[PDB]
Ligand SMILES: *[C@@H]1O[C@H](CO)[C@@H](O[C@@H]2O[C@H](CO)[C@@H](O)[C@H](O)[C@H]2NC(C)=O)[C@H](O)[C@H]1NC(C)=O
């Protein structure tokens with residue numbers, strides 16, 4: 001009905017309506033990072049997604 | 051003592067280079083530290099998940 005991996009999590013599953021194999025992968029996420037020259041110099045900032 | 055046997059020490063250096071080139075791939079256990087740290091990180095991630 002479903003598969004697993006080394007992490008023992010959900011990565012593949014069989015739909016209960018048809019016979020087509022599906023795959024489960026989480027979408028894009030991560031910790032946001034910031035680059036700034038400091039408040040004493042300027043105010044422009046460069047936001048970064050890691 | 052350098053220029054008395056310059057050809058001899060050049061041949062010895064080439065032989066040592068060939069010997070270490072053979073010995074780097076002679077056994078798969080000559081890089082134990084990198085394999086150990088990689089396996090330790092992989093096992094830490096595996097027990098974490
Ligand atoms: C569950 O019902 C759906 C209804 O769409 C079935 O899907 C159809 O099944 C017939 C019979 O094989 C096919 O000829 C159609 O092409 C299918 N349609 C689609 C959109 O897939 C499905 O087979 C049924 N499942 C079970 C286990 O009975």
Ligand SMILES: *[C@@H]1O[C@H](CO)[C@@H](O[C@@H]2O[C@H](CO)[C@@H](O)[C@H](O)[C@H]2NC(C)=O)[C@H](O)[C@H]1NC(C)=O
Nearest residue numbers: 055057058059060061062063064065066067069
């Ligand atoms: C000093 O040692 C080197 C290496 O052990 C000797 O070089 C070898 O000499 C023999 C016979 O002369 C050759 O068959 C080998 O091919 C040489 N080896 C290499 C890597 O070239 C050298 O002859 C020795 N010198 C003295 C004065 O004993």
